[PDB]
Amino acid sequence: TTKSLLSADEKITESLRSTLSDVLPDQLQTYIRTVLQFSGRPEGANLLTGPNTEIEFFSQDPNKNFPNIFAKYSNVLTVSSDPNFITSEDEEVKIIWGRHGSDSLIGFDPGADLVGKRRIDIFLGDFIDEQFNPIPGALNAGKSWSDRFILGDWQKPYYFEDDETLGLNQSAMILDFNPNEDVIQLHGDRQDYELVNISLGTAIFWREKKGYDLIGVLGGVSDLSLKGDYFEFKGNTAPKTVLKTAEHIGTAANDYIFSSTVDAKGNFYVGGGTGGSLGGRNIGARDAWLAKYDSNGNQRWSRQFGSTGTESLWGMASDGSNIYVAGNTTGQLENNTVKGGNDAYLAKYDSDGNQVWIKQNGTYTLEESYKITVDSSGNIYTAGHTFELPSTDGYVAKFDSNGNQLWVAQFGTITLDDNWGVAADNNGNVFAGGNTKGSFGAKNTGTAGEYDAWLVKLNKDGQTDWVRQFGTPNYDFMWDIETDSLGDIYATGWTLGDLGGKNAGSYDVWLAKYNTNGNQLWIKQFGTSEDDAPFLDGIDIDANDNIFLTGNTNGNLGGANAGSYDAWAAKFDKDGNQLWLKQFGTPDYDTATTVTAVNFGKLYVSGITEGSLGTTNAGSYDSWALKLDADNGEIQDFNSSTNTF
């Protein structure tokens, strides 16, 4: 069996070498080989057989530049504790990079058709910016977080070919697993696995009577045990259902709500991304989707659209009757226009679920867009960022109801500026907000380029009225903004510092208010000793100027934690007094992603879960929508109405 262990090392080495060298671009192979060579890790370097190729950043062809090449083969997540909210089965090899925070990393979609496909997901739990940045004395120097690498769920092991081979065509490769801190999540129980010592570290094999299948390789770690607390086993039964009052949305694939809205008749909409056939037949990898509910909880229609590439619905807004939707695509959604491979889109749906038009910005420059708003006059605003040194800059774009572009405003600093907010006032003006490593509206007090929050006010012509910036010396991260009926601008985010008050521990939530003239009115901060943050579409403001916030916590923020991260929602008045704070979820990972206030004192909070929220989990990530009473945060049945029982 010594001979069998030697044969496994050869077959794994030759299989990974073949796939990584065929798929990864030569610029990426060259960088990775240099890091491994410099660290004297030849076993890793010798997996990459492409020629040494110069790394380029200043080509006139964006497609020849390292960031654009890297973008195709990566999911680069945020400074937050992130679920992989950008996962999609669109490449054979993908780098999944958590960066700071306690990330819940998945790359595989167990509901996708991957029979016979090569799949390697390369996981970096941390590999925080400070590890690459040579400047000394950063606040977050040496910091690491507990990352969870998801290699199976209650339904099935991931990367499983279930055949007569060692199952080398599909595998995870985890590069920075720390058994003192991180977790590897597996299907089944410890009797279903064998650990094998290989040249690269540890091989995790699925083992049954019929044979062996490689599930993952743990780079640079040896002599682990399946009895370790760093392995979490999910068994083979769906989790018990909680919150049967929720609307449940799920397929066997990874399904996400990322946004919601309401129209002038009280119809409630949700939308996001899916790796499955949720609102229609899957077109390939992740698709965008949206669904309409009447004011009584009844689904009217669902729609799914996209490409063989990756797209999501990240924002939606209504003019009262139509539903405008925005997000990102790696495909070509508008047949009149070229595809850049990483492009913003805007589409218009009518109340009957017809796609009236779609507009795509087909340029080769990397573009992301997570935010949309509609004004009184029915004009549409989107916001996002575009990536002569390499860097993101913010933009706002204004359109008419026929999808004609009225103007585009681009702005920012010499360094990273990301957009996480757009909101119109009732007065022809539009606000944007986001994160910057630089000094955009103030000198950034961060000594190693830690993020601050920024806000811009633009007028009806896209000219800048003002820029503001606020922050601590540590990372502060904005997720979302909204206007009230007076035209004041509110932003929400997390901080690792003392922004509105003394940090309670780890990530805390903040809520900032500026007046229309750029004066900061107040910043509130709240949290537990644990990780608390709003997320994605995390603020809304009703007709009465009540502020609603939503996101996730792994503490006891609104009540006892059910397990992992839970969702939370809060109500504030326009002077920043907290009126209520509710927490809800499953024993498994949950987060809210969006909040929509409606009328008759009801509110919808929607999000994602790895558990059974509303009904039995259909596979991996599922989504949910909860109807709350706006007076006290009490959960109502989604289908509750005054005319039914």
Q: How many CA atoms lie within 13 A of 241 on its CB side?
A: 12
The Cα–Cα gap between 633 and 613 comes to 18
Report the Cα 33 to chain-centroid distance in Å: 29
Q: Which stretch binds Na ion (CB under 5 A): 154-162, 251-259, 293-301, 464-472?
A: 154-162
Measured distance between the N- and C-terminal CA atoms of the chain, rounded to whole angstroms:
66
Rounded CA gap, 548 and 558, in Å? 14
Work out whether 156 is an interface residue with Na ion (CB under 5 A).
Answer: yes
Segment 298 to 357, residues that bind Mg ion, using CB under 5 A: 302
By CB under 5 A, residue 192 contacts Ca ion:
no
Q: Are 589 and 609 in contact (CB under 8 A)?
A: yes
* Distance of closest approach, residue 264 Cβ to Br ion, in angstroms: 29
Sheet with 104-105: list strands edge to edge: 104-105, 148-150, 183-186, 231-233
Indicate whether 359 belongs to the interface with Na ion (CB under 5 A): no
* Interface with Ca ion, residue 147, by CB under 5 A: yes
Which token pair is 166? Answer: 């060692």
100 binds Na ion (CB under 5 A): no
216 closest CA partner among 165, 178, 254, 175: 175
Closer Cβ to Na ion, 188 or 501, answer by number = 188
Per-position x/- string for 280-309, each x denoting binding to Mg ion as judged by CB under 5 A, each - no binding: ----------------------x-------
Q: Which is nearer to Ca ion, 450 or 542 (CB)?
A: 450
What DSSP string describes 10-26?
Answer: HHHHHHHHHHHHHHS-H
Percent of the chain as helix, strand, coil, to the nearest 5: 10, 40, 50
Q: Report the residue from 82, 90, 121, 130 that binds Br ion according to the rule CB under 5 A.
A: 130
Edge-first strand listing for the sheet containing 417-424: 417-424, 430-436, 452-458, 464-470
The amino acid occupying position 422 is: V
Based on the shown chain and the rule CB under 5 A, indicate whether residue 345 belongs to the binding site for Ca ion: no
Our finding on whether 452 is near Ca ion (CB under 5 A) is: yes
* Residue 255 found at the interface with Ca ion (CB under 5 A): yes
Answer yes or no whether residue 82 interacts with Ca ion by CB under 5 A: yes
Classify burial at 367, counting beta carbons within 10 Å of its beta carbon; exposed 0-12, middle 13-18, buried 19 or more.
buried
Q: Which residues are annotated as a binding site for Mg(2+)?
A: 71, 74, 163, 165, 208, 212, 246-247, 279, 302, 447, 480, 537, 539-540
Stretch that binds Br ion, among 226-234, 310-318, 421-429, 523-531 (CB under 5 A): 310-318
In sequence order, what DSSP letters do the residues of 582-617 get, joined into one string? EEE--SS-EEEEEEEE-STTEEEEEEEESS-BSS--
Give the range of 336-344, 398-406, 537-545, 551-559 binding Mg ion by CB under 5 A.
537-545
Binding mask 31-60 for Br ion (x = CB under 5 A): ---------x-x------------------
Q: Which is nearer to Na ion, 97 or 159 (CB)?
A: 159
**How many Å apart are CA 409 and CA 375, to the nearest integer?**
17
Write the burial class of residue 213 (CB in 10 Å: 0-12 exposed, 13-18 middle, 19+ buried): buried
Q: Does 131 bind Br ion (CB under 5 A)?
A: yes
List the one residue from 6, 35, 141, 414 that touches Br ion (CB under 5 A).
Answer: 141
> Which residues contact Mg ion (rule: CB under 5 A)?
279, 302, 480, 537, 539-540
> Which residues contact Ca ion (rule: CB under 5 A)?
77, 82, 98-99, 101, 103, 125-126, 144-145, 147, 159, 167, 170, 182, 213-214, 250, 255, 283-285, 287, 306, 391, 393, 412-413, 417, 450, 452, 471-472, 476, 504-506, 508, 527, 532, 562-564, 566, 585, 590, 618-619, 622
